[PDB]
Design an enzyme around this catalytic site. Structure first.
Site, PDB file in Angstrom:
ATOM      1  N   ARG B 151       0.809  -1.210   0.000  1.00 34.44           N
ATOM      2  CA  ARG B 151       0.000   0.000   0.000  1.00 34.44           C
ATOM      3  C   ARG B 151       0.840   1.257   0.000  1.00 34.44           C
ATOM      4  NH1 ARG B 151      -2.694  -3.986   1.840  1.00 34.44           N
ATOM      5  NH2 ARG B 151      -4.989  -4.075   1.915  1.00 34.44           N
ATOM      6  N   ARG B 255     -10.294  -9.182   1.801  1.00 34.51           N
ATOM      7  CA  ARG B 255     -11.514  -9.364   1.020  1.00 34.51           C
ATOM      8  C   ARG B 255     -12.228 -10.652   1.382  1.00 34.51           C
ATOM      9  NH1 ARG B 255     -12.001 -10.627  -5.395  1.00 34.51           N
ATOM     10  NH2 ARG B 255     -14.235 -10.254  -5.735  1.00 34.51           N
ATOM     11  N   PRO B 328      -9.491 -21.005 -15.138  1.00 32.68           N
ATOM     12  CA  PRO B 328     -10.632 -21.774 -15.650  1.00 32.68           C
ATOM     13  C   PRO B 328     -11.733 -20.867 -16.190  1.00 32.68           C
ATOM     14  CG  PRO B 328     -10.020 -22.473 -13.435  1.00 32.68           C
ATOM     15  CD  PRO B 328      -9.352 -21.161 -13.681  1.00 32.68           C
ATOM     16  N   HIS B 356     -19.112 -25.558 -11.790  1.00 31.02           N
ATOM     17  CA  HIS B 356     -19.296 -24.114 -11.909  1.00 31.02           C
ATOM     18  C   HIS B 356     -19.223 -23.691 -13.380  1.00 31.02           C
ATOM     19  CE1 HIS B 356     -18.607 -19.800 -10.405  1.00 31.02           C
ATOM     20  NE2 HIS B 356     -18.388 -19.732 -11.705  1.00 31.02           N
ATOM     21  N   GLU B 357     -18.092 -23.946 -14.033  1.00 30.79           N
ATOM     22  CA  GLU B 357     -17.866 -23.386 -15.364  1.00 30.79           C
ATOM     23  C   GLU B 357     -18.861 -23.931 -16.385  1.00 30.79           C
ATOM     24  OE1 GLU B 357     -16.030 -20.734 -15.655  1.00 30.79           O
ATOM     25  OE2 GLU B 357     -14.827 -20.871 -13.848  1.00 30.79           O
ATOM     26  N   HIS B 360     -21.993 -21.906 -16.418  1.00 30.65           N
ATOM     27  CA  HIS B 360     -21.913 -20.727 -17.304  1.00 30.65           C
ATOM     28  C   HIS B 360     -22.239 -21.196 -18.698  1.00 30.65           C
ATOM     29  CE1 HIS B 360     -20.005 -17.894 -14.513  1.00 30.65           C
ATOM     30  NE2 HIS B 360     -19.047 -18.766 -14.256  1.00 30.65           N
ATOM     31  N   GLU B 384     -22.261 -15.184 -12.629  1.00 32.04           N
ATOM     32  CA  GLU B 384     -21.423 -15.772 -11.595  1.00 32.04           C
ATOM     33  C   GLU B 384     -22.230 -16.527 -10.558  1.00 32.04           C
ATOM     34  OE1 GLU B 384     -18.535 -16.297 -13.183  1.00 32.04           O
ATOM     35  OE2 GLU B 384     -18.243 -16.776 -11.070  1.00 32.04           O
ATOM     36  N   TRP B 459     -11.761   6.552   4.073  1.00 31.31           N
ATOM     37  CA  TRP B 459     -11.567   5.132   3.826  1.00 31.31           C
ATOM     38  C   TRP B 459     -11.645   4.440   5.182  1.00 31.31           C
ATOM     39  CZ3 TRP B 459     -12.308   1.846   0.250  1.00 31.31           C
ATOM     40  CH2 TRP B 459     -11.634   0.608   0.179  1.00 31.31           C
ATOM     41  N   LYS B 463     -13.887   1.588   7.167  1.00 35.78           N
ATOM     42  CA  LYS B 463     -13.393   0.237   7.478  1.00 35.78           C
ATOM     43  C   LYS B 463     -13.603  -0.069   8.953  1.00 35.78           C
ATOM     44  CE  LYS B 463     -10.828  -1.733   3.912  1.00 35.78           C
ATOM     45  NZ  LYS B 463     -11.033  -3.022   3.191  1.00 35.78           N
ATOM     46  N   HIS B 487      -9.632  -4.717  -8.654  1.00 33.89           N
ATOM     47  CA  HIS B 487     -10.887  -4.208  -9.169  1.00 33.89           C
ATOM     48  C   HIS B 487     -10.969  -2.699  -9.195  1.00 33.89           C
ATOM     49  CE1 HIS B 487     -12.477  -8.335  -8.888  1.00 33.89           C
ATOM     50  NE2 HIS B 487     -11.556  -8.398  -7.941  1.00 33.89           N
TER      51      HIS B 487
HETATM   52 CL   LIG Z   1      -7.062  -1.182   2.280  1.00 39.01          CL
HETATM   53 ZN   LIG Z   2     -17.277 -18.291 -12.980  1.00 32.92          ZN
END
Ligand SMILES: [Cl-]
Ligand SMILES: [Zn+2]
Lengths: 174, 597
Positions: B151, B255, B328, B356-357, B360, B384, B459, B463, B487
């Site tokens: 960071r 995450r 995948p 999973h795949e 789709h 998804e 931020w 948090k 992202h």
């Molecule tokens: Cl962060």
């Molecule tokens: Zn997927």
């Protein structure tokens, strides 16, 4: 007798510019083709046997497009390239020609018409290639509302059977 | 004739021209991702840009037809989609510049590596190495160092760019009649006309925040639990009523708390629900794996994979000689061409992934008859989610038995189930506040609510309030932690990961009810249940065609997003947690810090 010249024939026409072959005189058995799991479709319309006695149209379409070579039927192919009468009939035959009529890189000879003012009358044909305006105006691609009416199939070898090339023979009876 | 009928006769040339021109780019893209050559990677750019070119052409071409004077919805949808200025609405400079900012961020994020002060000769990047530390190392310092380096090095570099980014992007966004770039993204969830099924770019935030409340009780309890479990691992470093040090949450950003399992396991004494052992024993191979997944879908009334799927896909790595990228993926190339790229190893994880795949894929087929522009999950969340239900049903010990992978006479200890659930929570429930908080702050930045000079203040203020985590080191505006995450620093709406995640429960639920399932909702496997398939396929075959609200209806019988199903899936865990937390404190002080000593 001269069926070798139609099926088993090297070069096939696009649907929009389909071929008619006239066969009178000559008598055959029909058992030439009666027995083959090469043919994928073979739906007949009003008959099936041998009484010893004729028109044979041929062309290529996409897999899903075969549905449309039957009396009635939705459109684009039946609306615009090849219409079968509701009335008269014989038989309709198809086979998968992925190997022949399609390539890794993609094959684009085969064409069809998707734009036309009016629908075909059964057995009618249209080989015009005139830029299409949905009002009859003249044209000049791509002048906002001007398109060419012919579309390329573009047959690749790795597409769903729906989108693979199929040869077709329609045997009308007279 | 009429602008309607004459628009129909535009889309029609567009579909049957785009379809092919797209299949060009796919076939290329595919060649590359499988025979990584210089020859190939270049082709991947030809048709690739010819696509972007073909698009911009048809975009500006589609502008010609007035949004206003139309009524066949389907057509209005398609046209709308196509008339997407995006970059056009800007200058020439203030457009290529944006473009510049983006690519630099992307690369600096991908290309950023950090340097070991205790040994400068070895310096690894995020993946792997850093990500590896965050996932495994149990050393406070070792951990704190990775987290901070990242960071601090690449965090700061991105600050200026990200500052510039938010402007041009908002400039862009506002120009297309949007309140802000956030308002642009929320855009995905919009629907007009169609009474009874409408939705506005406000209705989202309203609905997200409303839903996110009911999670809290659950969250705070999972929080409270791991907190105490962590104190044990890092004794003295943690406060029993404080937030969680951001660098102790198992990955770089926290995450997902997945990797914390080893430390938080309810019953460490219970073992594998892993048949990786049993699969390799019965000599299964790639084919068997997918051929099984095939069976599973057929079982609920869905079709066999296409002949083209078998003869075109790549279910196995060719090793060296032909090097391939192995993430995948399902491929919907168009022209009835459906493929999976998966470098398969005979592992449960992979076995699941294949379910999973191939999900789709099944979606991709379902909506194939739709015109080209309407081939696509209802909203960014839908695809998804469908993917994920499949792993839900396949992972049940029931399904694993009825297949000969799970040894016949194995019973379910309520402890193995609590294990598994906690497992799920670490991922499914941990990531939720994380997510929602992340995109709130992003949203607010775009609504112009966070001043440049108070970016990192706000931020971490959030948090602490929302997520219950704290920084190990304090961070001024020199930093830019939000963009430390793919992202964000790669221009991607993150909120999808929240909605999908909800849907995917509303779905699996609806489907079990319909499959008539008797146990806890999480024991549910929808196999052999054709009745349930029908109900799924009902939304599936739609693609982007109907409004997503209707699309959702077809499956769960409701017009909006509901969290109850998710909470249900966590009932037996949730209660058990309230128990373990008897003597624990539940909630946190935003005020405590790891630092300032
Ligand atoms: Cl962060
Ligand atoms: Zn997927």
């Amino acid at each position: 007798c001269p069926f070798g010249e139609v099926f088993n024939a090297t070069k096939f026409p696009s649907v929009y510019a389909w071929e008619r072959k006239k066969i009178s005189n000559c008598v055959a058995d029909y058992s030439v083709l009666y027995n083959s799991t090469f043919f994928s479709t073979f739906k007949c319309y009003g008959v099936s046997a041998t009484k010893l006695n004729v028109y044979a149209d041929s062309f290529v379409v996409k897999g899903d497009d075969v549905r449309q070579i039957a009396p009635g039927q939705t459109g684009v192919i039946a609306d615009y390239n090849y219409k079968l009468p509701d009335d008269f009939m014989g038989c309709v035959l198809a086979w998968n020609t992925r190997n022949i009529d399609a390539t890794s890189t993609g094959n684009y000879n085969y064409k069809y018409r998707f734009l036309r003012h009016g629908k075909l009358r059964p057995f009618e044909r249209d080989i015009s290639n005139v830029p299409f305006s949905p009002d009859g105006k003249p044209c000049t691609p791509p002048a906002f509302n001007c398109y060419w009416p012919l579309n390329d199939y573009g047959f690749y070898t790795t597409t769903g059977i729906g989108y693979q090339p199929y040869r077709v023979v329609v045997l009308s009876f007279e | 004739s009429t602008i309607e009928e004459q628009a129909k006769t535009f889309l029609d040339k567009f579909n049957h021209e785009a379809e092919d021109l797209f299949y060009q780019s796919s076939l290329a893209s595919w060649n590359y991702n499988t025979n990584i050559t210089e020859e190939n990677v270049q082709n991947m750019n030809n048709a690739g840009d010819k696509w972007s070119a073909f698009l911009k052409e048809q975009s500006t071409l589609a502008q010609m037809y007035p949004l206003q004077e139309i009524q066949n919805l389907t057509v209005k949808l398609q046209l709308q989609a196509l008339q997407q200025n995006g970059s056009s609405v800007l200058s020439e400079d203030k457009s290529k510049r944006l473009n510049t900012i983006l690519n630099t961020m992307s690369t600096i994020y991908s290309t950023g590596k950090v340097c070991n002060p205790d040994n400068p000769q070895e310096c690894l990047l995020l993946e792997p190495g850093l990500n590896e530390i965050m996932a495994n190392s149990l050393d406070y310092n070792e951990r704190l160092w990775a987290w901070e380096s990242w960071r601090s090095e690449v965090g700061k570099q991105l600050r200026p760019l990200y500052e510039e980014y938010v402007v041009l992007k908002n400039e862009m966004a506002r120009a297309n009649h949007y309140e802000d770039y956030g308002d642009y993204w929320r855009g995905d969830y919009e629907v007009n006309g169609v009474d009874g099924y409408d939705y506005s770019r406000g209705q989202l935030i309203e609905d997200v925040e409303h839903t996110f409340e009911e999670i809290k009780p659950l969250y705070e309890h999972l929080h409270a639990y791991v907190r105490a479990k962590l104190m044990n691992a890092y004794p003295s470093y943690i406060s029993p009523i404080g937030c969680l040090p951001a660098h102790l949450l198992g990955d770089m950003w926290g995450r997902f708390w997945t990797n914390l399992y080893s430390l938080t396991v309810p019953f460490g004494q219970k073992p594998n629900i892993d048949v990786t052992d049993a699969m390799v024993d019965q000599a299964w191979d790639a084919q068997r794996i997918f051929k099984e997944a095939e069976k599973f879908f057929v079982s609920v009334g869905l079709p066999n994979m296409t002949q083209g799927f078998w003869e075109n896909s790549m279910l196995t790595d060719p090793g060296n000689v032909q090097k391939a990228v192995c993430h995948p993926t399902a491929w919907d190339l168009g022209k009835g061409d459906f493929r999976i790229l998966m470098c398969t190893k005979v592992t449960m994880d992979d076995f699941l992934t294949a379910h999973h795949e191939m999900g789709h894929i099944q979606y991709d087929m379902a909506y194939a008859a739709q015109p080209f522009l309407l081939r696509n999950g209802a909203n960014e969340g839908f695809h998804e989610a469908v993917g994920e239900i499949m792993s839900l049903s396949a992972a049940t010990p029931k399904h694993l038995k009825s297949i000969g992978l799970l040894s016949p006479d194995f019973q379910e200890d309520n402890e193995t189930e609590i294990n598994f659930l906690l497992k799920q929570a670490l991922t499914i429930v941990g990531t939720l506040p994380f997510t929602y908080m992340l995109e709130k702050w992003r949203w607010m930045v775009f609504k112009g609510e966070i001043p440049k000079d108070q970016w990192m203040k706000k931020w971490w203020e959030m948090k602490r309030e929302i997520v219950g985590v704290v920084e190990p080191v304090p961070h001024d505006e020199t930093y830019c932690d939000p963009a430390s995450l793919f992202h964000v620093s790669n221009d991607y709406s993150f909120i999808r990961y929240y909605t999908r995640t909800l849907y995917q429960f509303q779905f699996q639920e609806a489907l079990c009810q319909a499959a008539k399932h008797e146990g806890p909702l999480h024991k549910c496997d929808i196999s052999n249940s054709t009745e349930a398939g029908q109900k799924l396929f009902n939304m599936l075959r739609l693609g982007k065609s109907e409004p997503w609200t209707l699309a959702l209806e077809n499956v769960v019988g409701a017009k909006n997003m509901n969290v109850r199903p998710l909470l249900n899936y966590f009932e037996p865990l949730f209660t058990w947690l309230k128990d373990q937390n008897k003597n624990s404190f539940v909630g946190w002080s935003t005020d405590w810090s790891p630092y300032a000593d």
